[PDB]
Amino acid sequence: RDLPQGFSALEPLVDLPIGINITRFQTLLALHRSYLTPGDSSSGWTAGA
Amino acid sequence: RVVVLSFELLHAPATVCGPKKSTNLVKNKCVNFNFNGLTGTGVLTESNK
Numbered sequence: 836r837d838l839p840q841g842f843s844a845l846e847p848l849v850d851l852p853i854g855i856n857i858t859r860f861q862t863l864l865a866l867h868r869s870y871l872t873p874g875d876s877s878s879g880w881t882a883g884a
Numbered sequence: 885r886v887v888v889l890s891f892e893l894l895h896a897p898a899t900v901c902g903p904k905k906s907t908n909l910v911k912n913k914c915v916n917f918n919f920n921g922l923t924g925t926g927v928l929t930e931s932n933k
Contacts, residue, residue, distance in 0.1 A: 853897075854896025
């Protein structure tokens, strides 16, 4: 668990000329319909840790 | 046949523009330069950086 102690500088990835007024955001998570590993038998959605 | 081109100068970034000029790149002589909007005057030389 937790963030590691240490210094790290993030590099530029991309810059988009999109002009929209953002005030809110949300994360997108994967939900697996089935098992995390082939050959389980439990029903419905799961997520990996 | 008719086409009407029309242009918006609106508040989001300027985003469509006409094709920018370019020239040969001379070295070891005093010149004026523009590099991607960076203007100046100088002797241009192959860097060790």
